[PDB]
Amino acid sequence: AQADIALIGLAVMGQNLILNMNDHGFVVCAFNRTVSKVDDFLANEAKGTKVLGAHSLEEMVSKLKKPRRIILLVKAGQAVDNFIEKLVPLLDIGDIIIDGGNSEYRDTMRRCRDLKDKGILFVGSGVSGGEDGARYGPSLMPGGNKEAWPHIKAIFQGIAAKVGTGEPCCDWVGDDGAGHFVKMVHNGIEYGDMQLICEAYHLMKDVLGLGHKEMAKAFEEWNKTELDSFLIEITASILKFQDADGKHLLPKIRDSAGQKGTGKWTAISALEYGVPVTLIGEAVFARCLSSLKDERIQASKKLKGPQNIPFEGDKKSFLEDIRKALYASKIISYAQGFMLLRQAATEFGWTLNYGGIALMWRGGCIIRSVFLGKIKDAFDRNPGLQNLLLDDFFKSAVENCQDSWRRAISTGVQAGIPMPCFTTALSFYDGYRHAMLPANLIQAQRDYFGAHTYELLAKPGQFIHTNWTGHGG
Amino acid sequence: AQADIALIGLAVMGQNLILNMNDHGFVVCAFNRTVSKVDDFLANEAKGTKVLGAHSLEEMVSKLKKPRRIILLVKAGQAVDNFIEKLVPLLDIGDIIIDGGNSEYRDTMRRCRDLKDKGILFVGSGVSGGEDGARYGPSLMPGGNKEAWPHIKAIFQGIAAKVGTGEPCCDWVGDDGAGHFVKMVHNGIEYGDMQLICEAYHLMKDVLGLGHKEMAKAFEEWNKTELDSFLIEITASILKFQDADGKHLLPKIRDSAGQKGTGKWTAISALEYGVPVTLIGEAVFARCLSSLKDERIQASKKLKGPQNIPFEGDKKSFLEDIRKALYASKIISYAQGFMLLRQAATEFGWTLNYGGIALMWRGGCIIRSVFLGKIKDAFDRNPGLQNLLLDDFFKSAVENCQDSWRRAISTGVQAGIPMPCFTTALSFYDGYRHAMLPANLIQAQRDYFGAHTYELLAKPGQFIHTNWTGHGG
Ligand SMILES: NC(=O)c1ccc[n+]([C@@H]2O[C@H](COP(=O)([O-])OP(=O)(O)OC[C@H]3O[C@@H](n4c(Br)nc5c(N)ncnc54)[C@H](OP(=O)(O)O)[C@@H]3O)[C@@H](O)[C@H]2O)c1
Ligand SMILES: NC(=O)c1ccc[n+]([C@@H]2O[C@H](COP(=O)([O-])OP(=O)(O)OC[C@H]3O[C@@H](n4c(Br)nc5c(N)ncnc54)[C@H](OP(=O)(O)O)[C@@H]3O)[C@@H](O)[C@H]2O)c1
């Protein structure tokens, strides 16, 4: 018994995590099912370290100090069950299996329970940051069977990213599939930030007639304001990047965005639990829209746009307007984000700490920014805050962006620039603001052709059906 | 053996369908699990008819002429399986069970298959029209095991609604859960038309400062143009309706729209199969938004809108603009609609006839309009049409609405009127029109932090990963 923990999965991610643990002075024993890679790694990337290698699961198992704790960094689905299947014969009661892959939260729920009756503590951690992050400090969102926590605590917390105060971007998220649900919402939001930036980019390019150099200038200027964040930083870099031949690389890239399912799942869960997360949803369908590249080429030949009117206005004011519109829409996407988190917390009975979650996304992870700090502030002042838009900072932030956000959308709209996420954020803001909505008309017509029954404004609760057919006749 | 068919389920729907069949001269034997209702119906609504009553399933079963065909009009889920369970012992090979309830298409797929190995022909029909329709002529969308079709054909076709040419709004849709998938897309679209009308209503009300009388005037004027349809007709009636006390009824109704899940499922399936059906999706989230009525009241007190600028323009021109914007967005929602249908057809291997489907929605059903006729035209001229927007009628229709649709959205946007479906339809139109989209930026950043790899515009197919980190350093 010498290894404090094991990690199974030696793709770069696993590999880097093992090293990161090693630097914090934890003896890890690695394992992988194509076992040659254990040697390959010990010889190459890991030479000089304290990491032990294992050639059999039972070897890995005997290596472990108790409580045994092993991590799975294997891609999702079937694979994780199969590893689990094998590990159970070999484990004692009180032992711990961790699933770091991007697993479906219902599978984590299943596995966690099933194992608890077998006496094994199971946790599902979301891991974020990518390779870079896995090596120096990822954010780790662990949920599942709470008993496990104190045993992995010092490890998880020690290898995580920490923001300035020294806080690790990792703490116990909650029961069952909490860690893995939070993780998919993170990615859902990640989709959202990217699409907004594309929209911001599309207005500069097509309306303002800007070039990639000034565009990167603009983005790095913006990264000095409230938009200070990782995806704004990297977009500045991406826009300046000269290919081998001198030309800019970006306009050479094919416009068919991929997705490995997480953002999609976020949108499914919102539709299932009745939460209006419109911007992540628009983002997911935007990526599907970009996949019909051949259709679009065919379409551009047949479908006309607006009459061409130039932009007779000021390039730098409008550039300011685009910044505001972006910032405002970012806030909406996050409020919709934490709404879903709240609903989930109530449908599965998890006690989520939203301020904690925000801190766990302030470092390591791809959506990291200063902005998450300002969200954290909100939930410390009020853990019970019902919607983020109600917090004074954010209500002040959006009314301050009012005129610009509506100006930008409107100009975009005349020019023919597709803005799916800028528009849903404004529609949602205007929708949520109104204490009375035309949904009454919906209720009336449902009752007309389908007799579904309706409530009155006053006397909420008693249902009526009107014979509308004729008021007589 | 005297009954040509049986119907199990004596809610008004079942009841009316039985009568409708009876008028076409088919002896039906009714059954229901609270058996007293069979008497209740025979004595009351059905007295004087040819309908027989049954007190035991085995009684119902012996009543039947062969091939035995019985219809289930029971609400979905568990219930339908249980009826099925019981009917199998009692049925012979070649017998037919029909499911008219709004069942999940995956359940229809399961049941259809399972039964085929038991030798029973199973069909899932979507039924639309509501009570009214079930009595004189519903639209019936039947899918499942094709063998069944010729045996029920004359019945189904005979009791269906028929449009002017004499065509029944019913024909064989296709295999497995085709009929029930089509049905849920119908409802998805139904949601879409309603939300658009609410949006149209919200601009007249809040911007144009119109009153319910002129608003109904406007809607019935519009029902004389391309918008001639059932939901426009009934909205005219709904707006004029005076309550007991003289006042208009509509503004007394609580604005929290319900949904019995179908529209939602449509949006799930689109997210699952990667189809950008943005307007039905916006519609579903709009209904969820209206359920947070208490939140909205709380929100209106804290969240500011745009600076109040009146509408200094012309009320009747703008009213024309709203009509156009509605019509245009209707077209987009339907194109997105038939896209999903096409994708489904390809993922399950159904040979859907889209012109047929359109005819099946031109009568009986809630979304019926003249508009469906013009869609039918498109798929007759070209069964292979890839997207409805490419058809000459519709491309001409939308460019004709260009200026008004963008004018209306823009004014809405300044005024603070929530338009989620008007905006996604314009964003989608502008998105689909562009042969090149900023999705390239998405692809570039995914490759940056996650190494996902990208394609080049030219040389579509070979994947590259750039070390962006520093172009040196
Ligand atoms: N760039 C990165 O490194 C990166 C970025 C973002 C996220 N991730 C995270 O790391 C996780 C896994 O790494 P990846 O993204 O490269 O995904 P992969 O799909 O490449 O997963 C690689 C691992 O899965 C193991 N595995 C497979 Br594949 N099938 C297995 C099976 N049937 N039984 C047992 N083990 C099996 C492989 O073992 P083998 O190699 O012996 O086949 C390998 O260790 C992801 O789910 C995600 O959480 C990684
Ligand atoms: N206004 C309308 O009539 C209308 C409008 C729109 C759609 N629909 C359509 O008609 C269908 C059913 O009518 P509905 O909308 O009133 O829905 P309901 O949920 O009221 O379904 C009523 C039927 O379900 C039967 N049933 C139930 Br409930 N539980 C059952 C069980 N456990 N085992 C066997 N049978 C069971 C009832 O028998 P019991 O009465 O003996 O309990 C009754 O015949 C819907 O799914 C839909 O397709 C009707």
PDB file of N, CA, C and O and ligand atoms in Angstrom, chain A residues 449-452, chain B residues 8-14 16 31-35 37 72-76 78-80 82-83 86 100-103 125-131 134 183 366, ligand 2:
ATOM      1  N   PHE A 449     -60.577  25.934 -28.580  1.00  0.00           N
ATOM      2  CA  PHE A 449     -60.676  24.725 -29.392  1.00  0.00           C
ATOM      3  C   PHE A 449     -60.452  23.435 -28.610  1.00  0.00           C
ATOM      4  O   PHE A 449     -60.809  22.351 -29.080  1.00  0.00           O
ATOM      5  N   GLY A 450     -59.874  23.525 -27.418  1.00  0.00           N
ATOM      6  CA  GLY A 450     -59.550  22.304 -26.708  1.00  0.00           C
ATOM      7  C   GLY A 450     -60.138  22.176 -25.330  1.00  0.00           C
ATOM      8  O   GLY A 450     -59.800  21.253 -24.587  1.00  0.00           O
ATOM      9  N   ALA A 451     -60.950  23.140 -24.958  1.00  0.00           N
ATOM     10  CA  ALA A 451     -61.592  23.158 -23.662  1.00  0.00           C
ATOM     11  C   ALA A 451     -60.652  22.985 -22.473  1.00  0.00           C
ATOM     12  O   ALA A 451     -61.123  22.579 -21.418  1.00  0.00           O
ATOM     13  N   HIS A 452     -59.394  23.403 -22.551  1.00  0.00           N
ATOM     14  CA  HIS A 452     -58.442  23.161 -21.458  1.00  0.00           C
ATOM     15  C   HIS A 452     -58.659  23.830 -20.113  1.00  0.00           C
ATOM     16  O   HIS A 452     -58.052  23.330 -19.168  1.00  0.00           O
TER      17      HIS A 452
ATOM     18  N   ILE B   8     -62.453   2.025 -27.529  1.00  0.00           N
ATOM     19  CA  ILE B   8     -62.339   1.945 -26.090  1.00  0.00           C
ATOM     20  C   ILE B   8     -61.826   3.322 -25.704  1.00  0.00           C
ATOM     21  O   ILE B   8     -60.757   3.724 -26.165  1.00  0.00           O
ATOM     22  N   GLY B   9     -62.635   4.000 -24.894  1.00  0.00           N
ATOM     23  CA  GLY B   9     -62.354   5.329 -24.382  1.00  0.00           C
ATOM     24  C   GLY B   9     -63.552   6.217 -24.665  1.00  0.00           C
ATOM     25  O   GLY B   9     -63.774   6.622 -25.815  1.00  0.00           O
ATOM     26  N   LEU B  10     -64.366   6.495 -23.643  1.00  0.00           N
ATOM     27  CA  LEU B  10     -65.579   7.276 -23.849  1.00  0.00           C
ATOM     28  C   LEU B  10     -65.577   8.652 -23.215  1.00  0.00           C
ATOM     29  O   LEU B  10     -66.582   9.094 -22.668  1.00  0.00           O
ATOM     30  N   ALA B  11     -64.428   9.327 -23.264  1.00  0.00           N
ATOM     31  CA  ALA B  11     -64.355  10.768 -23.023  1.00  0.00           C
ATOM     32  C   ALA B  11     -65.054  11.398 -24.256  1.00  0.00           C
ATOM     33  O   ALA B  11     -65.296  10.681 -25.250  1.00  0.00           O
ATOM     34  N   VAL B  12     -65.332  12.706 -24.286  1.00  0.00           N
ATOM     35  CA  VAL B  12     -66.093  13.298 -25.394  1.00  0.00           C
ATOM     36  C   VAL B  12     -65.506  12.994 -26.743  1.00  0.00           C
ATOM     37  O   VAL B  12     -66.251  12.566 -27.625  1.00  0.00           O
ATOM     38  N   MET B  13     -64.183  13.068 -26.817  1.00  0.00           N
ATOM     39  CA  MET B  13     -63.451  12.691 -28.024  1.00  0.00           C
ATOM     40  C   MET B  13     -63.879  11.330 -28.618  1.00  0.00           C
ATOM     41  O   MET B  13     -64.269  11.259 -29.792  1.00  0.00           O
ATOM     42  N   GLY B  14     -63.885  10.282 -27.787  1.00  0.00           N
ATOM     43  CA  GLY B  14     -64.179   8.925 -28.222  1.00  0.00           C
ATOM     44  C   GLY B  14     -65.594   8.762 -28.694  1.00  0.00           C
ATOM     45  O   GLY B  14     -65.926   8.223 -29.753  1.00  0.00           O
ATOM     46  N   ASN B  16     -67.605  11.195 -29.644  1.00  0.00           N
ATOM     47  CA  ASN B  16     -67.879  11.893 -30.899  1.00  0.00           C
ATOM     48  C   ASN B  16     -67.399  11.152 -32.125  1.00  0.00           C
ATOM     49  O   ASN B  16     -68.077  11.129 -33.161  1.00  0.00           O
ATOM     50  N   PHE B  31     -66.682   0.398 -25.677  1.00  0.00           N
ATOM     51  CA  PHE B  31     -66.268  -0.206 -24.426  1.00  0.00           C
ATOM     52  C   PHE B  31     -65.525   0.874 -23.660  1.00  0.00           C
ATOM     53  O   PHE B  31     -65.098   1.854 -24.258  1.00  0.00           O
ATOM     54  N   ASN B  32     -65.339   0.765 -22.362  1.00  0.00           N
ATOM     55  CA  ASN B  32     -64.621   1.744 -21.541  1.00  0.00           C
ATOM     56  C   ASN B  32     -64.328   0.982 -20.238  1.00  0.00           C
ATOM     57  O   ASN B  32     -65.104   0.060 -19.948  1.00  0.00           O
ATOM     58  N   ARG B  33     -63.281   1.260 -19.444  1.00  0.00           N
ATOM     59  CA  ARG B  33     -63.022   0.418 -18.281  1.00  0.00           C
ATOM     60  C   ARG B  33     -63.966   0.710 -17.106  1.00  0.00           C
ATOM     61  O   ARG B  33     -64.230  -0.221 -16.335  1.00  0.00           O
ATOM     62  N   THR B  34     -64.452   1.942 -16.885  1.00  0.00           N
ATOM     63  CA  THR B  34     -65.545   2.146 -15.932  1.00  0.00           C
ATOM     64  C   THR B  34     -66.738   1.870 -16.840  1.00  0.00           C
ATOM     65  O   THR B  34     -67.108   2.685 -17.689  1.00  0.00           O
ATOM     66  N   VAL B  35     -67.249   0.661 -16.723  1.00  0.00           N
ATOM     67  CA  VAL B  35     -68.245   0.141 -17.650  1.00  0.00           C
ATOM     68  C   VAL B  35     -69.616   0.807 -17.599  1.00  0.00           C
ATOM     69  O   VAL B  35     -70.361   0.739 -18.582  1.00  0.00           O
ATOM     70  N   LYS B  37     -70.391   3.838 -17.864  1.00  0.00           N
ATOM     71  CA  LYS B  37     -70.384   4.831 -18.926  1.00  0.00           C
ATOM     72  C   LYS B  37     -70.842   4.272 -20.266  1.00  0.00           C
ATOM     73  O   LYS B  37     -71.342   5.033 -21.093  1.00  0.00           O
ATOM     74  N   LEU B  72     -57.968   2.471 -29.361  1.00  0.00           N
ATOM     75  CA  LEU B  72     -57.735   2.923 -28.009  1.00  0.00           C
ATOM     76  C   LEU B  72     -57.714   4.449 -28.060  1.00  0.00           C
ATOM     77  O   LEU B  72     -56.960   5.001 -28.869  1.00  0.00           O
ATOM     78  N   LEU B  73     -58.553   5.103 -27.272  1.00  0.00           N
ATOM     79  CA  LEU B  73     -58.601   6.540 -27.092  1.00  0.00           C
ATOM     80  C   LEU B  73     -58.616   6.678 -25.595  1.00  0.00           C
ATOM     81  O   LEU B  73     -59.626   6.876 -24.943  1.00  0.00           O
ATOM     82  N   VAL B  74     -57.451   6.447 -25.067  1.00  0.00           N
ATOM     83  CA  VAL B  74     -57.176   6.413 -23.637  1.00  0.00           C
ATOM     84  C   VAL B  74     -55.983   7.349 -23.496  1.00  0.00           C
ATOM     85  O   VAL B  74     -55.160   7.387 -24.430  1.00  0.00           O
ATOM     86  N   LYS B  75     -55.808   8.058 -22.388  1.00  0.00           N
ATOM     87  CA  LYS B  75     -54.637   8.936 -22.329  1.00  0.00           C
ATOM     88  C   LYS B  75     -53.446   8.057 -22.000  1.00  0.00           C
ATOM     89  O   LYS B  75     -53.528   7.050 -21.290  1.00  0.00           O
ATOM     90  N   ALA B  76     -52.437   8.532 -22.717  1.00  0.00           N
ATOM     91  CA  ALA B  76     -51.088   8.003 -22.852  1.00  0.00           C
ATOM     92  C   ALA B  76     -50.346   7.425 -21.664  1.00  0.00           C
ATOM     93  O   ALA B  76     -50.530   7.819 -20.508  1.00  0.00           O
ATOM     94  N   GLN B  78     -48.753   4.265 -19.507  1.00  0.00           N
ATOM     95  CA  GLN B  78     -49.058   2.994 -18.871  1.00  0.00           C
ATOM     96  C   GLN B  78     -50.351   2.324 -19.327  1.00  0.00           C
ATOM     97  O   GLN B  78     -50.332   1.166 -19.761  1.00  0.00           O
ATOM     98  N   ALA B  79     -51.393   3.150 -19.346  1.00  0.00           N
ATOM     99  CA  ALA B  79     -52.756   2.751 -19.666  1.00  0.00           C
ATOM    100  C   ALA B  79     -52.873   1.980 -20.971  1.00  0.00           C
ATOM    101  O   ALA B  79     -53.473   0.900 -21.010  1.00  0.00           O
ATOM    102  N   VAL B  80     -52.216   2.495 -22.006  1.00  0.00           N
ATOM    103  CA  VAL B  80     -52.268   1.907 -23.335  1.00  0.00           C
ATOM    104  C   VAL B  80     -51.608   0.525 -23.300  1.00  0.00           C
ATOM    105  O   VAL B  80     -52.150  -0.413 -23.893  1.00  0.00           O
ATOM    106  N   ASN B  82     -51.361  -1.541 -20.745  1.00  0.00           N
ATOM    107  CA  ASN B  82     -52.295  -2.372 -19.997  1.00  0.00           C
ATOM    108  C   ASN B  82     -53.479  -2.808 -20.829  1.00  0.00           C
ATOM    109  O   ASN B  82     -53.784  -4.008 -20.871  1.00  0.00           O
ATOM    110  N   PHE B  83     -54.071  -1.912 -21.588  1.00  0.00           N
ATOM    111  CA  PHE B  83     -55.112  -2.369 -22.484  1.00  0.00           C
ATOM    112  C   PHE B  83     -54.582  -3.404 -23.480  1.00  0.00           C
ATOM    113  O   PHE B  83     -55.187  -4.465 -23.700  1.00  0.00           O
ATOM    114  N   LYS B  86     -54.018  -6.955 -22.038  1.00  0.00           N
ATOM    115  CA  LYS B  86     -55.241  -7.728 -21.951  1.00  0.00           C
ATOM    116  C   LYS B  86     -55.729  -8.176 -23.316  1.00  0.00           C
ATOM    117  O   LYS B  86     -56.046  -9.352 -23.480  1.00  0.00           O
ATOM    118  N   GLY B 100     -55.034   5.828 -30.943  1.00  0.00           N
ATOM    119  CA  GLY B 100     -55.395   7.188 -31.292  1.00  0.00           C
ATOM    120  C   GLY B 100     -54.906   8.210 -30.272  1.00  0.00           C
ATOM    121  O   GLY B 100     -54.978   9.411 -30.549  1.00  0.00           O
ATOM    122  N   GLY B 101     -54.461   7.823 -29.078  1.00  0.00           N
ATOM    123  CA  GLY B 101     -53.952   8.783 -28.111  1.00  0.00           C
ATOM    124  C   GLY B 101     -52.655   9.437 -28.556  1.00  0.00           C
ATOM    125  O   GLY B 101     -51.975   8.951 -29.472  1.00  0.00           O
ATOM    126  N   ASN B 102     -52.266  10.522 -27.897  1.00  0.00           N
ATOM    127  CA  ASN B 102     -51.039  11.263 -28.198  1.00  0.00           C
ATOM    128  C   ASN B 102     -49.878  10.552 -27.521  1.00  0.00           C
ATOM    129  O   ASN B 102     -49.350  10.992 -26.499  1.00  0.00           O
ATOM    130  N   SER B 103     -49.509   9.412 -28.065  1.00  0.00           N
ATOM    131  CA  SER B 103     -48.412   8.638 -27.515  1.00  0.00           C
ATOM    132  C   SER B 103     -47.046   9.087 -28.037  1.00  0.00           C
ATOM    133  O   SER B 103     -46.955   9.525 -29.190  1.00  0.00           O
ATOM    134  N   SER B 125     -52.286   6.371 -34.687  1.00  0.00           N
ATOM    135  CA  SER B 125     -52.860   7.488 -35.445  1.00  0.00           C
ATOM    136  C   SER B 125     -52.826   8.681 -34.539  1.00  0.00           C
ATOM    137  O   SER B 125     -52.984   8.567 -33.318  1.00  0.00           O
ATOM    138  N   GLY B 126     -52.443   9.780 -35.131  1.00  0.00           N
ATOM    139  CA  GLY B 126     -52.600  11.042 -34.446  1.00  0.00           C
ATOM    140  C   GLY B 126     -54.011  11.475 -34.788  1.00  0.00           C
ATOM    141  O   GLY B 126     -54.454  11.201 -35.919  1.00  0.00           O
ATOM    142  N   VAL B 127     -54.734  12.062 -33.843  1.00  0.00           N
ATOM    143  CA  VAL B 127     -56.077  12.559 -34.133  1.00  0.00           C
ATOM    144  C   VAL B 127     -56.058  14.064 -33.878  1.00  0.00           C
ATOM    145  O   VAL B 127     -55.481  14.483 -32.868  1.00  0.00           O
ATOM    146  N   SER B 128     -56.631  14.901 -34.724  1.00  0.00           N
ATOM    147  CA  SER B 128     -56.633  16.317 -34.440  1.00  0.00           C
ATOM    148  C   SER B 128     -57.977  16.851 -34.867  1.00  0.00           C
ATOM    149  O   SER B 128     -58.689  16.286 -35.713  1.00  0.00           O
ATOM    150  N   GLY B 129     -58.234  17.983 -34.226  1.00  0.00           N
ATOM    151  CA  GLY B 129     -59.478  18.714 -34.404  1.00  0.00           C
ATOM    152  C   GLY B 129     -60.157  19.048 -33.084  1.00  0.00           C
ATOM    153  O   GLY B 129     -60.831  20.063 -32.999  1.00  0.00           O
ATOM    154  N   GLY B 130     -59.981  18.229 -32.057  1.00  0.00           N
ATOM    155  CA  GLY B 130     -60.679  18.412 -30.802  1.00  0.00           C
ATOM    156  C   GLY B 130     -62.072  17.815 -30.948  1.00  0.00           C
ATOM    157  O   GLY B 130     -62.341  17.131 -31.944  1.00  0.00           O
ATOM    158  N   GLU B 131     -62.961  18.129 -30.007  1.00  0.00           N
ATOM    159  CA  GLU B 131     -64.325  17.603 -29.926  1.00  0.00           C
ATOM    160  C   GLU B 131     -65.099  17.835 -31.197  1.00  0.00           C
ATOM    161  O   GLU B 131     -65.565  16.883 -31.816  1.00  0.00           O
ATOM    162  N   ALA B 134     -63.721  15.799 -33.931  1.00  0.00           N
ATOM    163  CA  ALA B 134     -63.975  14.370 -33.756  1.00  0.00           C
ATOM    164  C   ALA B 134     -65.404  14.007 -34.159  1.00  0.00           C
ATOM    165  O   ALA B 134     -65.627  12.933 -34.727  1.00  0.00           O
ATOM    166  N   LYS B 183     -47.916  13.913 -35.795  1.00  0.00           N
ATOM    167  CA  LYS B 183     -48.849  14.524 -34.863  1.00  0.00           C
ATOM    168  C   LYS B 183     -48.159  15.478 -33.889  1.00  0.00           C
ATOM    169  O   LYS B 183     -48.624  16.612 -33.720  1.00  0.00           O
ATOM    170  N   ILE B 366     -56.170  21.844 -36.006  1.00  0.00           N
ATOM    171  CA  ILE B 366     -56.146  23.216 -35.485  1.00  0.00           C
ATOM    172  C   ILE B 366     -55.298  24.180 -36.326  1.00  0.00           C
ATOM    173  O   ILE B 366     -55.637  25.358 -36.441  1.00  0.00           O
TER     174      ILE B 366
HETATM  175  N1  LIG C   2     -61.744  17.471 -25.408  1.00  0.00           N
HETATM  176  C1  LIG C   2     -61.427  16.254 -25.828  1.00  0.00           C
HETATM  177  O1  LIG C   2     -62.253  15.323 -25.793  1.00  0.00           O
HETATM  178  C2  LIG C   2     -60.000  16.061 -26.363  1.00  0.00           C
HETATM  179  C3  LIG C   2     -59.241  17.138 -26.860  1.00  0.00           C
HETATM  180  C4  LIG C   2     -57.942  16.942 -27.348  1.00  0.00           C
HETATM  181  C5  LIG C   2     -57.388  15.661 -27.375  1.00  0.00           C
HETATM  182  N2  LIG C   2     -58.141  14.555 -26.912  1.00  0.00           N
HETATM  183  C6  LIG C   2     -57.716  13.159 -27.219  1.00  0.00           C
HETATM  184  O2  LIG C   2     -58.452  12.088 -26.556  1.00  0.00           O
HETATM  185  C7  LIG C   2     -57.536  11.322 -25.725  1.00  0.00           C
HETATM  186  C8  LIG C   2     -58.168  10.843 -24.417  1.00  0.00           C
HETATM  187  O3  LIG C   2     -59.194  11.727 -23.924  1.00  0.00           O
HETATM  188  P1  LIG C   2     -58.834  12.953 -22.921  1.00  0.00           P
HETATM  189  O4  LIG C   2     -58.011  13.976 -23.626  1.00  0.00           O
HETATM  190  O5  LIG C   2     -60.083  13.377 -22.221  1.00  0.00           O
HETATM  191  O6  LIG C   2     -57.837  12.271 -21.855  1.00  0.00           O
HETATM  192  P2  LIG C   2     -58.088  11.459 -20.495  1.00  0.00           P
HETATM  193  O7  LIG C   2     -56.827  11.403 -19.706  1.00  0.00           O
HETATM  194  O8  LIG C   2     -59.312  11.945 -19.787  1.00  0.00           O
HETATM  195  O9  LIG C   2     -58.413   9.993 -21.089  1.00  0.00           O
HETATM  196  C9  LIG C   2     -59.733   9.463 -20.860  1.00  0.00           C
HETATM  197  C10 LIG C   2     -59.782   7.955 -21.069  1.00  0.00           C
HETATM  198  O10 LIG C   2     -58.650   7.284 -20.465  1.00  0.00           O
HETATM  199  C11 LIG C   2     -59.152   6.077 -19.883  1.00  0.00           C
HETATM  200  N3  LIG C   2     -58.180   5.540 -18.907  1.00  0.00           N
HETATM  201  C12 LIG C   2     -57.583   6.238 -17.942  1.00  0.00           C
HETATM  202 BR1  LIG C   2     -57.838   8.070 -17.633  1.00  0.00          BR
HETATM  203  N4  LIG C   2     -56.777   5.442 -17.218  1.00  0.00           N
HETATM  204  C13 LIG C   2     -56.917   4.256 -17.772  1.00  0.00           C
HETATM  205  C14 LIG C   2     -56.315   3.090 -17.283  1.00  0.00           C
HETATM  206  N5  LIG C   2     -55.507   3.127 -16.217  1.00  0.00           N
HETATM  207  N6  LIG C   2     -56.620   1.947 -17.926  1.00  0.00           N
HETATM  208  C15 LIG C   2     -57.453   1.962 -18.978  1.00  0.00           C
HETATM  209  N7  LIG C   2     -58.036   3.090 -19.435  1.00  0.00           N
HETATM  210  C16 LIG C   2     -57.783   4.256 -18.833  1.00  0.00           C
HETATM  211  C17 LIG C   2     -60.458   6.562 -19.295  1.00  0.00           C
HETATM  212  O11 LIG C   2     -61.340   5.526 -18.897  1.00  0.00           O
HETATM  213  P3  LIG C   2     -62.293   5.921 -17.653  1.00  0.00           P
HETATM  214  O12 LIG C   2     -63.029   7.133 -18.094  1.00  0.00           O
HETATM  215  O13 LIG C   2     -63.145   4.704 -17.517  1.00  0.00           O
HETATM  216  O14 LIG C   2     -61.335   6.203 -16.556  1.00  0.00           O
HETATM  217  C18 LIG C   2     -61.038   7.382 -20.432  1.00  0.00           C
HETATM  218  O15 LIG C   2     -61.744   6.529 -21.341  1.00  0.00           O
HETATM  219  C19 LIG C   2     -56.313  12.212 -25.533  1.00  0.00           C
HETATM  220  O16 LIG C   2     -55.090  11.480 -25.360  1.00  0.00           O
HETATM  221  C20 LIG C   2     -56.256  12.876 -26.908  1.00  0.00           C
HETATM  222  O17 LIG C   2     -55.732  11.986 -27.917  1.00  0.00           O
HETATM  223  C21 LIG C   2     -59.437  14.789 -26.388  1.00  0.00           C
END
